[PDB]
Amino acid sequence: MISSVCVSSYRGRKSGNKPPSKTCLKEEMA
Numbered sequence: 591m592i593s594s595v596c597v598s599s600y601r602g603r604k605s606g607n608k609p610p611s612k613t614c615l616k617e618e619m620a
Contacts, residue, residue, distance in 0.1 A: 591597045597606035599614035608619030 591601065591603065591606050593606060594615050594617050595613060597615050598604060598620070599607040599610065606616040606620050607614040612619045614620060
C-alpha cells in the first residue's frame with residue numbers, strides 16, 4: 591500500500607488515509 595494520492599482511503603484499511611480532505615496517504619496527514 592504505497593500511493594501518494596489514494597491508497598488506504600477505503601481499501602478496507604486506515605493506514606495511508608488521513609481525513610478525505612488532504613491526501614489520503616501516510617505521506618501526508620495520514
